[PDB]
């Protein structure tokens, strides 16, 4: 219903150690930096870019530890105080309850891929219907050409 609470990415409640990723371009672009509204490091999480439209092998993983309801997600690019250009034009959500068995989130219609950002600055809020029940959430940047992506995220929902 109305459980759109920030789960801890910008606030710091989800600590650094709980945020992992496939790869990182630099230490300053590490997974931990992919927190919504953060300007620390080089401004976001950036993998050893670019993301290949055919091989979507890159991801940002958040470990929530307990089982949550994820009703909404929020994404941003690498604003880096107006000097950054990068963002994910699209992404897909993968999720696990045990960290072993991964489920691709799919809309009521059946589409996997969600529309991402249009710039590195503005937060884009994408609702999740059906809502996700997970302990682990993965954000996979999705593209149409080999482009450099960067992300800052936030998960919204409540605990079980």
């Amino acid at each position, epitope marked *: 219903a109305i459980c759109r609470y920030p789960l801890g990415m910008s606030g710091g409640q989800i600590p650094d150690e709980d945020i992992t990723a496939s790869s990182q*371009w630099s230490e300053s672009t590490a997974a931990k930096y992919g927190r919504l509204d953060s300007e620390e490091g080089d401004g976001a999480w950036c993998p050893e870019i670019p993301v290949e439209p055919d091989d979507l092998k890159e991801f940002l993983q958040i470990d929530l530890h307990t089982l949550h309801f994820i009703t909404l997600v929020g994404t941003q690019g690498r604003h880096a105080g107006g000097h*950054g250009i990068e963002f994910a034009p699209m992404y897909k959500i993968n999720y696990s309850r045990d960290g072993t068995r991964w489920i691709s989130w799919r809309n009521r219609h059946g589409k996997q891929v969600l529309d991402g950002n249009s710039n590195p600055y503005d937060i884009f809020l994408k609702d999740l219907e059906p809502p996700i029940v997970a302990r682990f959430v993965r954000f996979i940047p999705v593209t149409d050409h080999s482009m450099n992506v960067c992300m800052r995220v936030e998960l919204y929902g409540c605990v079980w």
Partner: nanobody
Amino acid sequence: QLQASGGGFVQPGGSLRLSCAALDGMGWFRQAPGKEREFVSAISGNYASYYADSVKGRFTISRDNSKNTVYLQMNSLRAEDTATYYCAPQRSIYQSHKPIYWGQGTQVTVSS
């Protein structure tokens, strides 16, 4: 290095258009006296335009390719908008660690 111009004194509620010329990634920044440089707006290169929450709706950015100059129409100007305005080229992470050399920036005073 880019050069900004077109500033001056304006009454609250007023309007002003700033100019900039010497480069796809391009941004508008301002320095209020006693404050650090902050982002105001940027035009990417499907040309995507974005504005700081503090200037959303009130300000507009547009790139001229017949004059190789980017403009910033600042409508409904309030006191808070008093600063020295600048423009600089945006960079990819691959160029993030390269020094920034700013250039000329015009004074904009929004007083009654």
